[model samples]
Target: QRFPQRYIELAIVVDHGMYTKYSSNFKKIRKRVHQMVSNINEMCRPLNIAITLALLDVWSEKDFITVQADAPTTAGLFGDWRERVLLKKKNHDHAQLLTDTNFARNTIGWAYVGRMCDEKYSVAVVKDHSSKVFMVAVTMTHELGHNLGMEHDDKDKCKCDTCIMSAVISDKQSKLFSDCSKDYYQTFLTNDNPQCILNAP
Candidate 1:
């Protein structure tokens, strides 16, 4: 079955500070990002449900903490932390978990800058005090996976180390989601997305 293609708009707002802390030298950042995008393509290729993560924007903003100064903060919950803070970006276009949100949750297209710290591990591109760009790429992929309709692997999610959907991240190695996750994104090909399907991509 040849599924149709959908080009989703993703406005990735990174932190200006990321240039200094997200990854080593910021050079590995693009490479890691490209890898992230590729994995998504691979995962959904079988079903032909292509996600053209179009770059509506890629500007850097203040740190996630600074932006969420009034919001709560805690360790070991970077995913929740980013989403909570990103809620503020909701009015604009953060990916909607879309339960109700009083009803404006639209994951088809969204925008929000991201920044989190994992300094204890060597997650940086160049392997430094900064977070590895690969991790950022992984995180971005995970966020969009939700928009595309995938779930966590489990409690030890990140620990899966090999799956693209793994929650446990601590290195620069690239990975992809298993069949369990792929099945869901594969359904995207059947969705009525004529409004955003891309012919070439």
Candidate 2:
């Protein structure tokens, strides 16, 4: 049996305010979120695992995975936003919701994967409006991969020139995952067991 032995549920929280700031159309925001989920599913399908995502208007008071928006203009808002979503009053340990607050802080889309709880994985993506929709989609897919237990292909290098986990973001080179990233995910699916990779798949 797989280590997780169950499907991973991903909860998505849409900050209506953020969408309204970018566009007046609620339908457009819905569509974007839907597309984001679809793309995520497409990437996870081959792993023989399922991704259950919940899109919410408000933060879940209970423990669950979450994704929320944060504007770049705010100070330390990225860390602040993450604290709200990652830490619950009941328990400090467990997977928490992810945030895109970094986009507001860095003016670029970025993501990180870590365990808010002991063994569970969580991810956060910084919101980025500068890139095209497809680019954003690709960027998100790469981030989600980390949450699913994959890591930067270049284990020793922070800048894996072509890996999806690369630290830098550029308009010219932001839409595709490097070959190493592709292989890493594939390998992850094959070795997803308790005794497998320590941190992720």
Candidate 3:
């Protein structure tokens, strides 16, 4: 049983080139991200889990080619970027950076993240403009879940398709966590964090 000790503070960045060159495609991707946040919020709100968007913008343009299709490295390499780029002027606690690079990886998105115990750790998330909007949303959200100390669901512990922590998700899968998955979240909530969930009211 593992637990995350930090709350969410995130930034969403779209590669400047991707937004300009594929405006329609990027718009769909952004819309998909919005839908996902809402869905996950609905699922976790009752559990007293609320994630904040510290930044969301298309202005931080970057150029890229999706040659290195690895997600974890992309996220890890660039996860602490906001401190260097955005936070000298503005500061955030427990922040996450999501970079939607214009480059396409043969695989899905990537997330560079810290351990559950690292209070000041940040997430660096990068992805290409695949136009696989729903899949992108899923991949992005999964990375954030890692920031929250979630892991792949165990088959013996969770019903498939009920939890986004699942490795394989279907189109119709609900955004809710399985009971077993929530046990992991419950730890994050009950453990030594200021933003933790509390006893039933």
Candidate 4:
């Protein structure tokens, strides 16, 4: 028996703040991002899905939109930018914005749920909480899971030691998706049947 796998092409944006924080070294920034994305891919391997970096943009001058500490505002503005500007550069299925702005306490990442292929909503904003690339990788995977239609794993129904869908991430996060996350992902695939993610990248 064989199973179909989905490929998601993700575009990454590094805000000016993050760019400046890294001393504006493009190569170094890209290398660090590559490390984070690699970790995300490793975590997602069990889901029968994979992600490819379609585009990487570092805001060298200034952020196109005002980057806010509030996750919702930042993510909303990013979505607008994605539909109006990013798609023109290249049509990526989903996008993630990495910012150094510290969000509210215990809030490291935010994304619109179940909006994987939607041009307007398939975006996430994540805060770089740690210098450890793998830690940021955990937040990225968690937010991307939201875009993929996975909700925070319910405590009573799903039981995984370190499930990626946990609302509050721990020091050691699970790389694998939980059964709860998988069920929602399956529903999203069948119901939306997003054509964007179906294409081979």
lDDT of 1 at 129: 22
**Residues 176-200 of candidate 4: C-alpha lDDT, one tens digit per residue:** 7888888888788778778888898
lDDT (0 to 1) per candidate:
0.38, 0.45, 0.52, 0.89
Per-residue C-alpha lDDT of model 3 across residues 114-185, encoded as one tens digit per residue: 243243345545464345555555566666566556777888877766566777656665566666666766
Clash number for model 4? 0
Candidate scoring better on lDDT of 2 and 3: 3
Give each prediction's root-mean-square deviation over alpha carbons: 11.5, 7.5, 5.5, 1.4
Local distance difference test, candidate 1: 0.38
User: What stretches of model 3 exceed 4 Å from their correct place?
Assistant: 1-7, 24-36, 59-68, 93-106, 112-120, 124-135, 190-201
**TM-score for each predicted model, relative to the true structure:** 0.45, 0.53, 0.67, 0.96
Which residue pairs in candidate 1 have backbone atoms (N, alpha carbon, C) closer than 3 angstroms, thus clashing? 13-113, 93-110, 93-111, 123-132, 124-132, 157-167, 158-167, 158-168, 164-176, 164-177
The TM-score between candidate 3 and the true structure equals 0.67
Off by over 4 Å in 4: 1-3
Pairs clashing within candidate 3: 16-61, 71-110, 75-112, 75-124, 76-112, 79-124
Q: What value of lDDT does candidate 2 attain over all alpha carbons?
A: 0.45
